[PDB]
Design a protein around this ligand. Structure first.
Ligand SMILES: C[C@H](N)c1ccc(NC(=O)C2CC2)cc1
Length: 152
């Protein structure tokens, strides 16, 4: 059958929102009111991979764009990027591993661990208007916990 996908937004546990701000550049900032139209809407696909009650493999595409979050080595470090794909072939159930996140539910929050790079997480900074990034350090200054809002 097709791959199953849900539209959603994400906010970090400090309640910062995710917006595009430049070519392939996703940043996190405090947003409320009219400006909330600026937030990125994801198409979260439920993909093939190792699964348990609280660890669910997903891909995170941008709604109606041929763009996915992906985890690659850059200058020898695990690195979050936006990657373009052939729009004829995506989304699909068997997404390549660089596109796969383990969506983990702990204490009413979500963490997104790289399937490719164990114990590296989608992260934000405490400061406003900085990149969303991959974070191999948890519980420090990096925010690895999120909430999801379902979108029509
Ligand atoms: C989508 C990916 N998470 C991402 C990667 C890089 C940036 N920004 C920069 O690299 C600018 C400071 C030099 C933003 C978002």
């Amino acid at each position: 059958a097709p791959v199953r996908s849900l539209n959603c937004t994400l906010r970090d546990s400090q309640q910062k929102s995710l917006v595009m701000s430049g070519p392939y550049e996703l940043k996190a900032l405090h947003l409320q009111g009219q400006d909330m139209e600026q937030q990125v809407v994801f198409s979260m696909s439920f993909v093939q991979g190792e699964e348990s009650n609280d660890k669910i493999p997903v891909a995170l595409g941008l709604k109606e764009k041929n763009l996915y979050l992906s985890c690659v080595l850059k200058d020898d470090k695990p690195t979050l990027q936006l990657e373009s794909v052939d729009p004829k072939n995506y989304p699909k159930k068997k997404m390549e591993k660089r596109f796969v996140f383990n969506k983990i539910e702990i204490n009413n929050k979500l963490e997104f661990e790289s399937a490719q790079f164990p114990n590296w997480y989608i992260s934000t900074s405490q400061a406003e208007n900085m990149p969303v990034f991959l974070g191999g350090t948890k519980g420090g200054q990096d925010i690895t916990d999120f909430t999801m809002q379902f979108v029509s």
